[PDB]
Amino acid sequence: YLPPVPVSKVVSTDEYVARTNIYYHAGTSRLLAVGHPYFPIKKPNNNKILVPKVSGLQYRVFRIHLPDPNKFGFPDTSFYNPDTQRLVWACVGVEVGRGQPLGVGISGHPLLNKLDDTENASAYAANAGVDNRECISMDYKQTQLCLIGCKPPIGEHWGKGSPCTNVAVNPGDCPPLELINTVIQDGDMVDTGFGAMDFTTLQANKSEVPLDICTSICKYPDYIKMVSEPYGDSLFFYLRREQMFVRHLFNRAGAVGENVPDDLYIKGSGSTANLASSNYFPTPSGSMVTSDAQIFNKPYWLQRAQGHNNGICWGNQLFVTVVDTTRSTNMSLCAAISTSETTYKNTNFKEYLRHGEEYDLQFIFQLCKITLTADVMTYIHSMNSTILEDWNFGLQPPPGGTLEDTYRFVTSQAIACQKHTPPAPKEDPLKKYTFWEVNLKEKFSADLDQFPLGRKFLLQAGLKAKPKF
Amino acid sequence: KVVSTDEYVARTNIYYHAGTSRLLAVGHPYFPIKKPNNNKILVPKVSGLQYRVFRIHLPDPNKFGFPDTSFYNPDTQRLVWACVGVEVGRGQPLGVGISGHPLLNKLDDTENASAYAANAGVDNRECISMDYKQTQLCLIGCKPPIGEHWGKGSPCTNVAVNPGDCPPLELINTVIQDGDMVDTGFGAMDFTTLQANKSEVPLDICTSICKYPDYIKMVSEPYGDSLFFYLRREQMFVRHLFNRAGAVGENVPDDLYIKGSGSTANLASSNYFPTPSGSMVTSDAQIFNKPYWLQRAQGHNNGICWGNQLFVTVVDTTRSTNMSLCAAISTSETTYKNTNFKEYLRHGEEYDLQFIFQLCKITLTADVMTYIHSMNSTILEDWNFGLQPPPGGTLEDTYRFVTSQAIACQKHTPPAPKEDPLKKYTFWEVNLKEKFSADLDQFPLGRKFLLQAGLKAKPK
Amino acid sequence: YLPPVPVSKVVSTDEYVARTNIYYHAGTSRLLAVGHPYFPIKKPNNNKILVPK
């Protein structure tokens, strides 16, 4: 059993693609965002947000549009036929600026299910009352990551599905679990070390974790399935560093789901008449932060990636996703409602919390062309045909079929006839999925020398750009 | 006089690969679920602390005949895989579990006391949890893993043994399986056997025998095929210092010391146990999920593999975190009460494997027909040139039975589908057979090697 | 669009500059400073600083 030949066995893009002599760059001025860490702000009666909830622990999603090269002429355009061929951008090198002085922020919760210290106890604990929840906080696991590719990052999380039907679920049963892939959206939350899942559905208490994550589903990237892709065009590249260690050890307090079989221990008495809660959970503790482990503010250079794409960005479209813990510092300020009285009082001062956010992007690019034959056309048409649309061969145009001449009938609409609304803006299927946006379309330049970053590109390849006089 | 495999070995030029789907895995930290009256388990306790062991199931290469069969005689030789290469998927962000016991024998701290302790209530057991030795490992080779661990020795009849005496002492050396007990270094053994108390330890570690490799004897295989490879890494030390409280085994000679009185008359705990501290973690500490390689190994085996069959094992602390649920049997009431919340747990688990391989071809001489036959004959069992021409032509049909006069009534004989001898040993199993295929162009990884190869990538 | 040619070049200094054979050095003797960390010192009635912070 071979069994047959045709596969067709996806190939290295670098086969048919050709690299040009020309490079460009453009970059944003910069980006900044302000928001409150813990919850968003809205008018109490209204649903309209007064202030957006923002914190470092929110993921960042950057979508970047490029103008069509093939709209864009050249100083000398003769070197190719624009008819028989196309032009496509390629991404050689990338940078992430981050400017904040580095420092750690933090979160907590006013009410948290807890028993007491498990580390050292002179005597057995007390009786469980109602609601012993306390106000305690902790630091999240320190982390850095970066993500690059033309297809959105694929997330995964734990989640609840439908139990197979034999036993009718009664209230209080253990809901079965499901592993679920999904697209990644902005504002979503890093793991705290509690794992990607839905607290909202799976945690009823709503008090089991600090605020920020209670609402949403923390998610985490699966390199496997992602990297698994046949085209690899999800992500062609990435880096990561993170670390954690223990600090404290506590107990849940609540109704016991199940008791250990006795045979695993021996009956107590008196103080030991009853068994304390079995539960335990750690308190994650971030560590010493260093300037070194910083992965940013340093250039990157790509040639070969695990995927067959080499820096190809189809559809003038490009994705970057990055998350940092290091700048999480939260400044806190105070306003005085009364400036007169000279006796200090806790009454006079309201408190507010805001968090700074600092990004920048600068992207190298390379220029490339594509010859057309059928095998060509075929091969693409297999991969993603939508791509074709924005290109023009030729169209197909329709060997794939034609519209039957929509009915246009002259009516004031006051005639007894139906509505008609002139159609078709939508170019993005993913418009369902919101996230942070930037447009570059205008910013390109053809001379590296003028930019801080680029000259390194030169330096890496040397080669005086020819400023002689 | 064992020799390298590759003495006789005859290579191919040719390679295939497979990689799993992945690993779907989960389950409860502490103990498995079953109907209370019953022994029938609802749901497994699942832990990292359960030893992590997986094993290989593959087609005979000789099964596939070739577009070009030409190059060899199937008969005058055999045709035998080698492993070229290996990779594990390991995907979870890394995590912390942690534990201890709700009852514990302890007296108290050592370090800090302003005064000697008070009197001992009986059954003073307490609830504390701990961390662990911080560790990963990976284990690579074809013969069964076997852990060696303590035992209670054999009391000979010389000393008449007295109620409560010391069990004599042993190291036990015994086959490894999946889902077995990591140590924190509390001794490689079963207290459940070897500790009366049953109040001494983390529940989980109450269960069963801590186990740890024997390189040395696995080092000591004649062929070194249990594994030809592994890696081993960890970090830890102690956190705190705490006294047990229990009836005296034995006491200290006075000459070693001086005498107190009153308060000071009375014995300070000789029961002394530390409280460990497992450390911080880092990305860089990750050993996982990276191109994994050999050529030469300590053993004669190089990729020398049998039954189309191999054993795989690895362990990691790093991800040990679970997560629980707060189950509100009533959502109705809007005012808070601890009442309403049951709690459940499982530990979700994940992996994958992608591995590169070669085949090799083997002609036949006595050495061949013997040295391994010598070494082990089980493969030529699997081959047909083990011979055995038999006798035995004839018998008699007699029919029919149903006639109700009675000729002896008959045959029992499925009897021996049984082939895995060690089959009663029970542990994880992975059949791979038909996942193989040619080109790493298609296969997400070892084209890593193919670039590590290089070689021109071939046209279209 | 096509990008126009309305620009200069701003150039590496090493273009027009010329390096010589000669070198020199000088350095301070040393610097010394003393002060109070937490606040500056001044005469209570005056605004004139008694000690620099």
Coordinates of C-alpha atoms in Angstrom, one line a residue, chain B residues 10-441:
Chain B
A10 CA 23.2 -3.3 7.4
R11 CA 21.6 0.1 7.0
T12 CA 19.0 1.4 4.7
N13 CA 19.0 4.8 3.1
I14 CA 15.4 5.1 4.0
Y15 CA 13.2 6.7 6.6
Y16 CA 9.6 7.3 7.7
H17 CA 8.0 9.1 10.5
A18 CA 4.9 9.2 12.6
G19 CA 3.7 11.4 15.3
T20 CA 0.8 11.0 17.5
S21 CA -2.4 12.8 17.4
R22 CA -1.3 14.3 20.7
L23 CA -2.2 13.6 24.3
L24 CA -5.7 14.1 25.7
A25 CA -5.3 13.4 29.4
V26 CA -6.8 14.6 32.7
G27 CA -7.8 13.4 36.1
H28 CA -8.0 13.8 39.8
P29 CA -5.2 14.8 42.0
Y30 CA -5.9 12.8 45.1
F31 CA -7.8 9.5 44.8
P32 CA -9.9 7.8 42.1
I33 CA -13.6 7.7 42.0
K34 CA -15.9 4.7 42.4
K35 CA -19.3 3.8 43.7
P36 CA -19.1 3.8 47.5
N37 CA -20.5 0.4 48.0
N38 CA -18.7 -0.7 44.9
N39 CA -15.2 -1.2 43.8
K40 CA -16.1 0.0 40.3
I41 CA -14.2 3.2 39.6
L42 CA -16.1 6.2 38.3
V43 CA -13.1 8.3 37.5
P44 CA -9.3 8.0 37.9
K45 CA -7.2 9.9 40.2
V46 CA -4.7 11.3 37.8
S47 CA -1.4 13.0 38.7
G48 CA 1.9 13.9 37.4
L49 CA 3.1 12.1 40.5
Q50 CA 1.9 9.0 38.7
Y51 CA 4.9 7.8 36.7
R52 CA 4.8 8.7 33.1
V53 CA 5.4 5.8 30.8
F54 CA 4.2 5.0 27.3
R55 CA 5.0 2.3 24.8
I56 CA 5.2 1.7 21.1
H57 CA 3.1 -0.3 18.7
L58 CA 4.2 -0.5 15.1
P59 CA 3.8 -2.5 11.9
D60 CA 6.3 -5.0 10.8
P61 CA 8.2 -3.2 8.1
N62 CA 8.5 -6.4 6.2
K63 CA 4.7 -6.2 5.8
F64 CA 4.9 -3.4 3.3
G65 CA 6.4 -4.6 0.0
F66 CA 7.9 -1.9 -2.0
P67 CA 7.5 0.0 -5.3
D68 CA 11.0 -1.3 -5.6
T69 CA 11.3 -4.5 -3.8
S70 CA 14.3 -5.4 -5.9
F71 CA 17.2 -4.4 -3.6
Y72 CA 17.1 -7.4 -1.4
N73 CA 15.9 -10.9 -0.7
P74 CA 13.2 -10.9 2.0
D75 CA 14.2 -14.4 2.9
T76 CA 18.0 -14.5 3.0
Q77 CA 17.6 -11.5 5.4
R78 CA 15.2 -9.6 7.5
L79 CA 14.3 -5.9 7.5
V80 CA 14.4 -4.0 10.7
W81 CA 13.6 -0.5 11.8
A82 CA 16.0 1.7 13.5
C83 CA 14.9 4.8 15.3
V84 CA 16.6 7.8 13.6
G85 CA 15.0 10.5 15.7
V86 CA 12.5 11.5 18.3
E87 CA 10.3 14.2 19.6
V88 CA 7.8 14.7 22.3
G89 CA 5.0 17.1 22.2
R90 CA 4.7 18.6 25.7
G91 CA 2.2 21.5 25.6
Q92 CA 0.9 22.8 29.0
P93 CA 2.0 26.0 30.4
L94 CA 3.8 25.0 33.5
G95 CA 2.1 24.5 36.8
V96 CA 2.1 23.9 40.5
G97 CA 0.3 21.3 42.4
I98 CA 1.0 20.9 46.1
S99 CA 0.0 18.7 49.0
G100 CA 0.4 17.2 52.4
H101 CA -2.0 15.7 54.8
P102 CA -5.0 16.9 56.8
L103 CA -3.8 14.8 59.7
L104 CA -0.1 14.7 60.3
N105 CA 2.2 13.3 62.9
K106 CA 4.1 16.2 64.1
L107 CA 5.4 17.4 67.2
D108 CA 6.5 20.9 66.0
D109 CA 9.2 23.1 64.8
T110 CA 12.8 22.5 65.7
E111 CA 14.2 25.9 65.0
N112 CA 11.9 28.2 67.0
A113 CA 10.7 27.6 70.5
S114 CA 11.0 30.1 73.4
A115 CA 10.5 27.2 75.7
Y116 CA 10.2 23.4 75.7
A117 CA 6.9 22.2 74.4
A118 CA 3.8 21.3 76.4
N119 CA 2.4 17.9 77.1
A120 CA 1.3 15.7 74.3
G121 CA -2.4 15.1 73.7
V122 CA -2.9 11.8 71.9
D123 CA -3.7 12.0 68.2
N124 CA -2.5 15.6 67.7
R125 CA -2.4 15.2 63.9
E126 CA -2.5 18.3 61.8
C127 CA -3.2 19.5 58.3
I128 CA -0.3 20.9 56.3
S129 CA 0.7 20.6 52.6
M130 CA 4.2 20.8 51.1
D131 CA 6.1 21.3 47.9
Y132 CA 8.4 18.9 46.2
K133 CA 11.7 18.1 44.4
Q134 CA 11.5 20.2 41.3
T135 CA 12.1 17.9 38.4
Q136 CA 11.7 16.8 34.8
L137 CA 13.0 13.7 33.2
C138 CA 13.0 11.8 29.9
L139 CA 13.7 8.1 29.3
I140 CA 14.6 6.5 26.0
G141 CA 15.2 2.9 25.2
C142 CA 13.7 -0.5 24.3
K143 CA 13.8 -2.7 27.3
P144 CA 11.4 -2.4 30.2
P145 CA 12.1 0.2 32.8
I146 CA 12.7 -1.2 36.2
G147 CA 12.8 0.8 39.4
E148 CA 14.8 -0.1 42.4
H149 CA 13.6 0.9 45.8
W150 CA 13.7 0.1 49.5
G151 CA 12.3 -3.0 51.1
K152 CA 11.8 -4.4 54.5
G153 CA 14.5 -7.0 55.1
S154 CA 14.1 -10.7 56.0
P155 CA 14.1 -11.2 59.8
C156 CA 16.1 -14.4 60.2
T157 CA 15.5 -16.5 63.2
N158 CA 18.1 -15.4 65.7
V159 CA 16.5 -12.6 67.5
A160 CA 13.0 -13.4 68.6
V161 CA 11.1 -10.4 67.4
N162 CA 9.1 -8.4 69.8
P163 CA 5.8 -6.6 69.2
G164 CA 6.5 -3.3 67.4
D165 CA 10.2 -4.1 66.5
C166 CA 12.2 -2.7 63.7
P167 CA 11.5 -4.2 60.3
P168 CA 14.8 -5.4 58.8
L169 CA 15.9 -3.6 55.7
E170 CA 16.0 -3.9 52.0
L171 CA 16.4 -2.4 48.6
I172 CA 13.9 -3.8 46.1
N173 CA 14.7 -3.8 42.4
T174 CA 11.6 -4.0 40.3
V175 CA 9.9 -3.2 37.1
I176 CA 8.8 0.3 36.4
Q177 CA 5.3 1.0 35.2
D178 CA 3.3 4.0 34.3
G179 CA 1.3 5.9 36.9
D180 CA 3.5 5.1 39.8
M181 CA 5.0 7.0 42.6
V182 CA 7.4 9.8 42.2
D183 CA 9.5 10.5 45.3
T184 CA 9.9 13.8 46.9
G185 CA 12.7 11.8 48.3
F186 CA 10.7 10.4 51.1
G187 CA 12.2 7.0 50.4
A188 CA 11.7 4.5 47.6
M189 CA 9.3 2.1 49.2
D190 CA 5.9 1.8 50.6
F191 CA 5.1 3.1 54.0
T192 CA 1.7 1.6 53.4
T193 CA 3.7 -1.5 53.7
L194 CA 6.4 -0.1 55.8
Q195 CA 4.7 2.5 58.0
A196 CA 2.1 1.5 60.6
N197 CA 1.1 5.1 61.1
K198 CA -0.9 5.9 58.0
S199 CA -1.0 9.4 59.5
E200 CA 2.6 10.2 58.4
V201 CA 2.4 11.5 54.9
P202 CA 0.6 13.0 51.9
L203 CA -2.2 10.8 51.1
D204 CA -1.0 10.1 47.6
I205 CA 2.4 9.3 48.9
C206 CA 0.8 7.1 51.5
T207 CA -0.3 5.0 48.6
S208 CA 2.6 3.4 47.1
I209 CA 6.3 2.9 46.4
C210 CA 8.5 5.8 45.6
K211 CA 10.5 4.9 42.5
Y212 CA 13.6 6.1 40.9
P213 CA 15.8 4.8 38.1
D214 CA 18.5 2.4 38.3
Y215 CA 20.9 3.7 35.7
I216 CA 23.6 1.5 37.2
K217 CA 21.9 -1.7 36.6
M218 CA 20.1 -0.3 33.6
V219 CA 23.7 0.8 33.0
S220 CA 24.4 -2.8 33.8
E221 CA 22.3 -4.5 31.1
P222 CA 24.5 -6.7 28.9
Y223 CA 23.1 -4.8 25.9
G224 CA 22.0 -1.6 27.6
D225 CA 18.5 -1.8 25.9
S226 CA 16.2 -1.0 28.9
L227 CA 17.0 2.5 27.8
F228 CA 19.8 3.6 25.6
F229 CA 18.8 7.1 26.6
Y230 CA 17.2 9.4 29.1
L231 CA 17.8 12.7 30.6
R232 CA 17.6 13.7 34.2
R233 CA 17.2 17.1 35.8
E234 CA 16.0 18.6 39.1
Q235 CA 16.3 21.3 41.7
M236 CA 15.3 21.5 45.4
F237 CA 16.3 21.9 49.1
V238 CA 14.5 22.2 52.4
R239 CA 12.0 24.8 53.6
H240 CA 11.4 24.0 57.2
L241 CA 12.1 21.8 60.2
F242 CA 9.5 19.9 62.2
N243 CA 9.3 17.3 64.9
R244 CA 7.1 14.2 64.7
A245 CA 5.3 13.1 67.8
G246 CA 5.1 9.3 68.5
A247 CA 5.9 6.5 70.8
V248 CA 9.6 5.8 71.3
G249 CA 11.5 3.3 69.2
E250 CA 14.8 3.9 71.0
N251 CA 16.6 6.5 73.1
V252 CA 19.9 8.3 73.4
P253 CA 22.6 7.3 75.7
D254 CA 22.9 9.8 78.5
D255 CA 26.7 9.9 78.4
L256 CA 26.1 11.8 75.2
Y257 CA 24.5 14.6 77.2
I258 CA 23.6 16.1 80.6
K259 CA 20.5 16.0 82.7
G260 CA 17.6 18.5 83.0
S261 CA 14.8 18.4 85.5
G262 CA 11.3 19.5 86.2
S263 CA 10.3 21.0 82.9
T264 CA 13.8 20.1 81.7
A265 CA 13.5 16.6 83.1
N266 CA 11.7 15.4 80.0
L267 CA 12.7 14.3 76.6
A268 CA 12.9 16.6 73.7
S269 CA 11.8 15.2 70.4
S270 CA 14.2 12.9 68.7
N271 CA 11.7 12.8 66.0
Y272 CA 13.1 15.2 63.6
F273 CA 12.0 15.8 60.0
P274 CA 12.7 18.6 57.6
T275 CA 10.2 20.5 55.5
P276 CA 11.5 20.7 52.0
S277 CA 11.6 23.6 49.6
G278 CA 11.1 23.0 45.9
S279 CA 12.3 26.0 43.9
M280 CA 11.4 28.4 41.3
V281 CA 10.9 27.4 37.7
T282 CA 12.0 28.9 34.4
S283 CA 11.3 28.6 30.8
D284 CA 15.0 27.9 30.2
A285 CA 14.8 25.0 32.5
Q286 CA 12.6 23.5 30.0
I287 CA 14.2 20.6 28.4
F288 CA 11.1 19.6 26.5
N289 CA 9.8 19.7 23.0
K290 CA 13.0 20.2 21.1
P291 CA 14.7 18.2 18.4
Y292 CA 16.0 15.1 20.1
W293 CA 18.9 13.1 18.8
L294 CA 21.3 10.3 18.9
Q295 CA 23.8 8.4 17.1
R296 CA 26.3 6.7 19.4
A297 CA 25.1 5.6 22.7
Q298 CA 26.7 3.8 25.7
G299 CA 25.3 0.5 24.4
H300 CA 25.8 -1.7 21.4
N301 CA 22.2 -0.9 20.5
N302 CA 21.9 1.9 18.2
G303 CA 18.2 2.3 17.4
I304 CA 18.1 -1.4 17.9
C305 CA 14.5 -2.2 18.3
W306 CA 12.2 -5.2 18.4
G307 CA 8.7 -6.3 18.2
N308 CA 8.3 -3.1 16.3
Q309 CA 8.1 -2.2 19.8
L310 CA 9.6 0.2 22.3
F311 CA 9.1 1.8 25.6
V312 CA 9.0 5.5 26.3
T313 CA 9.1 7.3 29.5
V314 CA 9.5 10.8 30.8
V315 CA 8.5 12.7 33.9
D316 CA 8.0 16.4 34.7
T317 CA 7.1 18.2 37.8
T318 CA 6.7 21.5 36.1
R319 CA 3.0 21.6 35.3
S320 CA 1.7 20.1 38.5
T321 CA -1.2 22.6 38.9
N322 CA -4.7 21.3 38.9
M323 CA -7.9 23.3 39.0
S324 CA -11.0 22.8 41.0
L325 CA -14.6 23.8 40.8
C326 CA -17.0 25.6 43.1
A327 CA -20.3 23.8 42.7
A328 CA -23.4 25.7 43.8
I329 CA -26.2 23.3 44.2
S330 CA -28.4 26.4 44.5
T331 CA -27.9 29.5 42.5
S332 CA -31.1 31.1 43.6
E333 CA -30.3 32.9 46.8
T334 CA -28.4 36.1 46.2
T335 CA -26.7 36.3 49.6
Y336 CA -23.5 34.5 50.3
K337 CA -23.2 31.3 52.2
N338 CA -20.4 28.7 52.3
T339 CA -23.2 26.2 52.3
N340 CA -23.7 25.9 48.6
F341 CA -20.3 24.9 47.3
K342 CA -18.9 21.4 46.7
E343 CA -15.4 21.2 45.2
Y344 CA -14.0 18.8 42.6
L345 CA -10.6 18.4 40.9
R346 CA -8.8 16.7 38.1
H347 CA -5.4 17.2 36.6
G348 CA -5.4 17.8 32.8
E349 CA -2.5 16.4 31.0
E350 CA -1.1 16.7 27.5
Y351 CA 1.7 15.5 25.2
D352 CA 2.7 14.4 21.7
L353 CA 5.4 12.3 20.1
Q354 CA 7.0 12.6 16.7
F355 CA 9.9 10.3 16.0
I356 CA 12.3 9.6 13.2
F357 CA 13.4 6.2 12.2
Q358 CA 15.5 4.1 9.8
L359 CA 15.2 0.5 8.7
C360 CA 18.0 -1.9 8.5
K361 CA 18.5 -5.2 6.8
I362 CA 20.0 -8.4 8.3
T363 CA 21.4 -11.4 6.5
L364 CA 21.7 -14.7 8.2
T365 CA 24.5 -16.8 9.6
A366 CA 24.7 -19.0 12.6
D367 CA 25.9 -15.9 14.5
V368 CA 22.8 -14.3 13.3
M369 CA 20.9 -17.5 13.6
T370 CA 22.4 -17.9 17.0
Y371 CA 24.0 -14.9 18.6
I372 CA 20.6 -13.3 18.9
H373 CA 19.0 -16.7 19.2
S374 CA 21.6 -16.9 21.8
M375 CA 20.9 -13.3 22.8
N376 CA 17.2 -13.8 22.7
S377 CA 15.4 -16.1 20.4
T378 CA 12.1 -14.3 20.7
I379 CA 12.5 -12.4 17.5
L380 CA 13.2 -15.5 15.3
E381 CA 10.1 -16.8 17.0
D382 CA 8.7 -13.8 15.2
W383 CA 10.7 -15.0 12.3
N384 CA 10.1 -18.2 10.6
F385 CA 13.6 -19.6 10.1
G386 CA 13.5 -21.0 13.6
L387 CA 13.3 -24.6 12.6
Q388 CA 11.6 -27.0 13.8
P389 CA 10.6 -29.4 11.1
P390 CA 8.1 -31.5 13.1
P391 CA 6.6 -35.0 12.8
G392 CA 3.0 -36.1 13.0
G393 CA 0.8 -37.0 10.0
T394 CA -2.5 -38.6 10.9
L395 CA -5.7 -38.8 12.9
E396 CA -9.3 -39.9 12.7
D397 CA -12.5 -38.0 12.2
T398 CA -15.2 -40.3 13.8
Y399 CA -18.2 -38.1 13.1
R400 CA -20.7 -37.2 14.3
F401 CA -20.8 -36.1 18.0
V402 CA -24.4 -34.9 18.2
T403 CA -25.6 -38.6 18.0
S404 CA -26.0 -38.6 21.8
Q405 CA -24.0 -41.7 22.3
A406 CA -20.8 -40.3 23.7
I407 CA -17.4 -39.9 22.3
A408 CA -15.4 -37.6 24.5
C409 CA -16.6 -34.0 24.0
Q410 CA -14.3 -31.4 22.9
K411 CA -11.8 -28.9 22.1
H412 CA -10.8 -26.0 24.3
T413 CA -8.4 -24.4 22.0
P414 CA -8.2 -20.7 21.5
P415 CA -5.7 -21.4 24.1
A416 CA -2.7 -19.2 23.5
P417 CA -3.4 -15.9 21.8
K418 CA -1.1 -15.0 24.8
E419 CA 2.1 -13.4 23.5
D420 CA 2.9 -10.4 25.7
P421 CA 4.3 -12.4 28.7
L422 CA 4.5 -9.2 30.8
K423 CA 0.9 -8.4 29.7
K424 CA -0.3 -8.7 33.3
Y425 CA 1.8 -5.7 33.9
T426 CA -0.5 -2.9 33.2
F427 CA 0.3 0.6 32.1
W428 CA -0.1 2.9 29.1
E429 CA 0.0 1.6 25.6
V430 CA 0.3 3.4 22.3
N431 CA -0.3 1.8 18.9
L432 CA 1.1 3.7 16.1
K433 CA 1.1 1.3 13.3
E434 CA -0.2 3.0 10.2
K435 CA 0.8 6.5 11.1
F436 CA 4.0 6.2 9.1
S437 CA 4.8 8.2 5.9
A438 CA 7.7 9.6 3.9
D439 CA 8.5 13.2 3.9
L440 CA 9.1 15.7 6.7
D441 CA 8.2 18.3 4.2

